[PDB]
Design an enzyme around this catalytic site. Structure first.
Site, short mmCIF file in Angstrom:
data_model
loop_
_atom_site.label_atom_id
_atom_site.label_comp_id
_atom_site.label_asym_id
_atom_site.label_seq_id
_atom_site.Cartn_x
_atom_site.Cartn_y
_atom_site.Cartn_z
N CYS B 106 4.97 -4.07 -0.48
CA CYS B 106 5.67 -3.11 0.60
C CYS B 106 7.05 -2.75 0.54
CB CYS B 106 5.67 -4.35 1.86
SG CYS B 106 6.14 -3.59 3.43
N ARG B 109 10.20 -3.72 3.73
CA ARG B 109 10.62 -5.12 4.00
C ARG B 109 11.93 -5.12 4.53
NH1 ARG B 109 9.58 -8.02 -1.45
NH2 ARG B 109 9.23 -5.81 -2.30
N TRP B 278 4.99 0.86 10.46
CA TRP B 278 4.94 2.17 10.85
C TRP B 278 4.79 2.99 9.57
CZ3 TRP B 278 9.16 -0.15 12.74
CH2 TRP B 278 10.42 -0.40 11.82
N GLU B 283 1.96 8.02 2.67
CA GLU B 283 0.61 7.25 3.02
C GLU B 283 -0.45 8.20 3.65
OE1 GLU B 283 2.76 4.00 5.02
OE2 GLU B 283 1.21 2.61 4.66
C1 HEM Z 1 7.77 -1.34 9.32
C2 HEM Z 1 7.77 -0.62 8.45
C3 HEM Z 1 6.89 -0.72 7.38
C4 HEM Z 1 6.73 0.12 6.20
C5 HEM Z 1 7.50 1.41 6.21
C6 HEM Z 1 5.84 -0.26 5.25
C7 HEM Z 1 5.35 0.50 4.16
C8 HEM Z 1 4.63 0.05 3.19
C9 HEM Z 1 3.80 0.73 2.38
C10 HEM Z 1 4.25 2.28 1.85
C11 HEM Z 1 3.06 0.26 1.62
C12 HEM Z 1 2.07 0.87 0.52
C13 HEM Z 1 0.54 0.81 1.14
C14 HEM Z 1 -0.33 1.36 0.23
O1 HEM Z 1 -0.09 2.33 -0.59
O2 HEM Z 1 -1.63 1.01 0.36
C15 HEM Z 1 2.98 -1.17 2.38
C16 HEM Z 1 2.12 -2.32 1.79
C17 HEM Z 1 2.23 -3.45 2.42
N1 HEM Z 1 2.79 -4.02 3.43
FE1 HEM Z 1 4.39 -2.73 4.44
N2 HEM Z 1 5.08 -1.43 5.66
C18 HEM Z 1 5.88 -1.80 6.77
C19 HEM Z 1 5.65 -2.97 7.70
C20 HEM Z 1 4.95 -3.91 7.21
C21 HEM Z 1 4.91 -5.19 8.04
C22 HEM Z 1 5.22 -5.42 9.28
C23 HEM Z 1 4.29 -6.22 7.22
C24 HEM Z 1 3.88 -7.56 7.65
C25 HEM Z 1 4.38 -8.38 8.45
C26 HEM Z 1 4.24 -5.37 5.68
C27 HEM Z 1 3.50 -6.01 4.65
C28 HEM Z 1 2.82 -5.38 3.68
C29 HEM Z 1 2.07 -5.86 2.69
C30 HEM Z 1 1.50 -7.47 2.49
C31 HEM Z 1 1.43 -4.78 1.90
C32 HEM Z 1 0.41 -4.81 0.68
C33 HEM Z 1 -0.79 -4.37 1.32
C34 HEM Z 1 -1.82 -4.20 0.12
O3 HEM Z 1 -1.50 -5.04 -1.00
O4 HEM Z 1 -2.66 -3.48 0.28
N3 HEM Z 1 4.54 -4.20 5.97
N4 HEM Z 1 3.89 -1.25 3.21
F1 LIG Z 2 -7.38 -3.52 -4.30
C1 LIG Z 2 -7.56 -2.33 -3.52
C2 LIG Z 2 -9.29 -2.20 -3.42
C3 LIG Z 2 -9.55 -1.11 -2.59
C4 LIG Z 2 -8.75 -0.75 -1.46
C5 LIG Z 2 -7.42 -0.88 -1.59
C6 LIG Z 2 -6.15 -0.41 -0.83
C7 LIG Z 2 -4.91 -0.29 -1.43
C8 LIG Z 2 -5.42 -1.29 -0.06
C9 LIG Z 2 -4.69 -0.77 1.18
N1 LIG Z 2 -3.31 -1.18 1.18
C10 LIG Z 2 -2.88 -1.13 2.54
C11 LIG Z 2 -2.93 0.25 3.23
C12 LIG Z 2 -2.33 0.13 4.60
C13 LIG Z 2 -2.81 1.05 5.45
C14 LIG Z 2 -2.08 0.97 6.81
N2 LIG Z 2 -1.11 0.28 6.86
C15 LIG Z 2 -0.62 -0.26 5.92
N3 LIG Z 2 0.65 -0.82 6.14
C16 LIG Z 2 1.34 -1.19 7.19
C17 LIG Z 2 2.47 -1.78 7.11
N4 LIG Z 2 2.36 -1.99 5.75
C18 LIG Z 2 1.50 -1.41 5.12
N5 LIG Z 2 -1.11 -0.49 4.57
C19 LIG Z 2 -6.90 -1.88 -2.69
#
Ligand code: HEM
Ligand SMILES: Fc1cccc([C@@H]2C[C@H]2CNCCc2ccnc(-n3ccnc3)n2)c1
Ligand code: HEM
Ligand SMILES: Fc1cccc([C@@H]2C[C@H]2CNCCc2ccnc(-n3ccnc3)n2)c1
Ligand SMILES: C[C@H](O)[C@H](O)[C@H]1CNc2nc(N)[nH]c(=O)c2N1
Ligand SMILES: C[C@H](O)[C@H](O)[C@H]1CNc2nc(N)[nH]c(=O)c2N1
Ligand SMILES: [Zn+2]
Lengths: 411, 407
Positions: B106, B109, B278, B283
């Site tokens: 993420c 963070r 957000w 994305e």
């Molecule tokens: C507040 C602004 C935030 C931004 C700008 C942000 C940004 C991102 C982005 C760009 C990704 C890549 C997602 C993808 O390509 O699938 C991501 C994944 C992730 N974010 Fe954030 N995020 C935010 C908030 C949060 C919050 C509030 C949490 C948890 C409390 C969080 C936890 C995670 C986790 C666990 C992933 C990995 C999910 C996965 O492996 O698919 N994020 N985030």
């Molecule tokens: F290992 C995989 C197999 C199928 C799909 C996949 C997609 C990458 C995982 C989605 N990751 C979260 C995408 C997402 C969407 C909307 N909001 C957030 N989000 C919001 C705050 N931080 C992240 N992330 C992985």
């Protein structure tokens, strides 16, 4: 143990058995992944097994494993080793070795071409001047008036590590970098340290923004010497944009031959510390990294100004916009001058195919995702969506310390 | 054993020590790196609970204190008798904020400690689940001034009573396979849109139909619920220079809210823990709009721009990709809905990295995920070496429910 990798755009899965033949270490452990880390004298004791393993692969590829040719060569190498401490590769083995080091370069996107490599055997070279002559012929053959050919020149292997052959330049062709008194930098900032050394060693620098560096060549562990590549051997391309006629006025040019000259080539335990090699440029190398990196020519602003972009907010993506045109210009210029070049979509697509073909026929293809993915437009190239296993096969191209940090000056 | 990470654009070197507290495994070995692979009892529980409580009581400067030791005994006692245990609200919030802190994939963070936690552990039913989600959605949206949030449903017990939100995000557009062999709407959701109909959803079969919620409580069968439209903020996508852009019929939702992950704290498992922040601009613009396996509109946009799509070498895909992303950031900013661009975001993450090395001794991070899917090397995180490892408390993936659910 079999290992599967998956493409998340095509759902194609591939199985890797090749990773089992991997000896060297990655830099990772079960508790830490160092996949984004850039960088994570040899006795008769360990040399023959290295020699054997190599010669074993060699003979399997020619379908002669266990043959008399095979066993006698194993025996021949052994005796040469405990008698003379090292050994010499046949020409056939050197070529094979070179091809495969390329083939195993998990960071190289261009490996589809790997079988078509021109190998020049400079193992009979003894002096810097000798080295110069060999290199010039490389630059000429590889350049081929713009229709580029893959080539590597290989100088004598290391002996006691006190008689190394080295090319002090990081690339055969590359532009000087001058640090000014006011802190600014004229030319390519990457090459500042190397430019300084050259000047110190006696080079007379024109001090322009695009001066081709001289070669600094080290033979048999002696102090290195300077040589100026004949300008007529150095193909350069003026950079212009196909729509923006003010682009030509940015005064940019680049050279056609990308030729890495500071790596170490390892074949069957043998270490070749001078082994310059050359392919042709993928566009983004020049367009994105050479021109737009903040620590290089950094033309982003100056280009963006001339584009009349909204430079007040980064959320206007003026940087992203400028980057694209510059890359467009680089490709345009090269194609116009009929100098070989490949765009990042073309290259990545080819690599995916190459990679697939390699799992089928070889059981794997080591690949470093962090490097294979182009430095712009990442996810609209197919490698982004491609899972990749990274490991280390031999023969291999390895990094080696800069020779100014190690060399013992004779005077 | 004490590692150093180098930024190759600034020569800044940070020393990492935090990794020495890593507990889980990466799937990498000394012989093979998997850094680009997408997914590499009472005796078990107590050590887990202890590690957590120790770091908790350390973070509050009462390490070794009586409160600390007491709580350790108190929890030890409960595990012995109930086989599980329950978290104090303070521990639950800390665990949540810290799971986010440890989320190496993420980029956002830096905001980690400003997480609003919604304790929904008293929830019993799907209807109850709906009410909590709706409240989360409304709170986090905040009329367009986004706030980070997590809502946490009761922890797993015997695996038979698992709470689950079946949607992968709270807010997503349906996907339908045509008789045409093509795909209308969002291809990533084709199969989910299926199950929605299979459970009884009346699909308006549009391009951008907001999916219903499919909530599962205490292991029961999941139930459909439609989010009140007035709580689902959407943004119409227009380009700040191409007036033909609006006719592309594009819109996206404002709230990005991951709902399919599993939150692990002190050994306890929260299988339903929707969270939201957000969007970073790319994305939506790069991945959602231009991935081939998605809305895949690049051609249509390029046609609209009259670009020589004859050869890859014109970099027309590249050209469109930029405009499309300009548009997205443009539209969101015009409608005052929070969004961050990849440049500001990555810069923020570099800063956050420097704070985390300085205040905690490191920051686990997954380079393959932190570098945005466009303009890679002109963001600062490209030239930033990152170490990846798994710290706990943590957000983990978990199997899609329709493969596990005992019906
Ligand atoms: C507040 C602004 C935030 C931004 C700008 C942000 C940004 C991102 C982005 C760009 C990704 C890549 C997602 C993808 O390509 O699938 C991501 C994944 C992730 N974010 Fe954030 N995020 C935010 C908030 C949060 C919050 C509030 C949490 C948890 C409390 C969080 C936890 C995670 C986790 C666990 C992933 C990995 C999910 C996965 O492996 O698919 N994020 N985030
Ligand atoms: F290992 C995989 C197999 C199928 C799909 C996949 C997609 C990458 C995982 C989605 N990751 C979260 C995408 C997402 C969407 C909307 N909001 C957030 N989000 C919001 C705050 N931080 C992240 N992330 C992985
Ligand atoms: C023929 C066309 C070729 C193309 C398009 C190509 C492409 C590339 C590119 C783009 C890189 C990334 C360089 C960087 O970002 O620093 C690379 C790295 C590399 N290539 Fe090539 N290459 C070609 C030929 C060759 C040849 C002939 C060899 C050796 C025989 C080779 C071996 C390598 C090695 C060893 C690396 C990693 C270098 C390092 O770690 O610094 N490639 N290749
Ligand atoms: F480990 C490192 C520490 C600092 C800088 C670094 C720069 C990346 C290495 C340069 N990589 C080779 C760049 C290059 C230049 C010209 N041609 C090629 N080339 C030619 C054929 N294949 C690649 N490659 C590494
Ligand atoms: C720190 C990071 O690993 C480093 O900047 C890498 C990232 N990927 C790269 N990829 C290529 N092709 N060339 C590079 O120099 C780099 N640099
Ligand atoms: C194969 C590769 O691991 C996969 O495509 C990854 C690459 N990096 C990513 N980065 C982000 N932020 N999100 C993703 O879904 C992915 N996908
Ligand atoms: Zn790894």
């Amino acid at each position: 143990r079999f290992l599967k990798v998956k493409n998340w755009e095509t759902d194609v899965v591939l199985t890797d058995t090749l990773h089992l033949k991997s000896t060297l270490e990655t830099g990772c452990t079960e508790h830490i992944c160092m996949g984004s880390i850039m960088l994570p004298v040899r006795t008769k004791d360990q040399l023959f097994p290295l020699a054997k393993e190599f010669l074993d692969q060699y003979y399997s590829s020619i379908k002669r494993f266990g043959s008399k040719a095979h066993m006698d060569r194993l025996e021949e190498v052994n005796k040469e080793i405990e008698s003379t401490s090292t050994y010499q590769l046949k020409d056939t083995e050197l070529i094979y070795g070179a091809k495969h080091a390329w083939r195993n370069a998990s960071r190289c996107v261009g490996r589809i071409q790997w079988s078509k490599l021109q190998v020049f055997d400079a193992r009979d070279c003894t002096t810097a001047h000798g080295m110069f002559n060999y290199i010039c012929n490389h630059v000429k053959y590889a350049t081929n008036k713009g229709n580029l050919r893959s080539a590597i020149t290989i100088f004598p292997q290391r002996t006691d590590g006190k008689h190394d052959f080295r090319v002090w330049n990081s690339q055969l062709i590359r532009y000087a970098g001058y640090k000014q008194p006011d802190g600014s930098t004229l030319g390519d900032p990457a090459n500042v340290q190397f430019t300084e050394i050259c000047i110190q060693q006696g080079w007379k620098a024109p001090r322009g923004r695009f001066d081709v560096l001289p070669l600094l060549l080290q033979a048999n562990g002696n102090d290195p010497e300077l040589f100026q590549i004949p300008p007529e051997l150095v193909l350069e391309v003026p950079i212009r944009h196909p729509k923006f006629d003010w682009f030509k006025d940015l005064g940019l040019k680049w050279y056609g031959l990308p030729a890495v000259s500071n790596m170490l080539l390892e074949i069957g335990g043998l270490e070749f510390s001078a082994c310059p090699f050359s392919g042709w440029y993928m566009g983004t190398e020049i367009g994105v990294r050479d021109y737009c990196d903040n620590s290089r020519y950094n033309i982003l602003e100056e280009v963006a100004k001339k584009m009349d972009l909204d430079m007040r907010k980064t959320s206007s993506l003026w940087k992203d916009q400028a980057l694209v045109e510059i890359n467009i210009a680089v490709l345009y210029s090269f194609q116009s001058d009929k100098v070989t070049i490949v765009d990042h979509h073309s290259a990545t697509e080819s690599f995916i195919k190459h990679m697939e073909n390699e799992y089928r026929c070889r059981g794997g293809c080591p690949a470093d995702w962090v490097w294979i993915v182009p430095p712009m437009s990442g996810s609209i190239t197919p490698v982004f969506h491609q899972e990749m296993l990274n490991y280390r096969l031999t023969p291999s191209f390895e990094y080696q310390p800069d020779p100014w940090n190690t060399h013992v000056w004779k005077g």
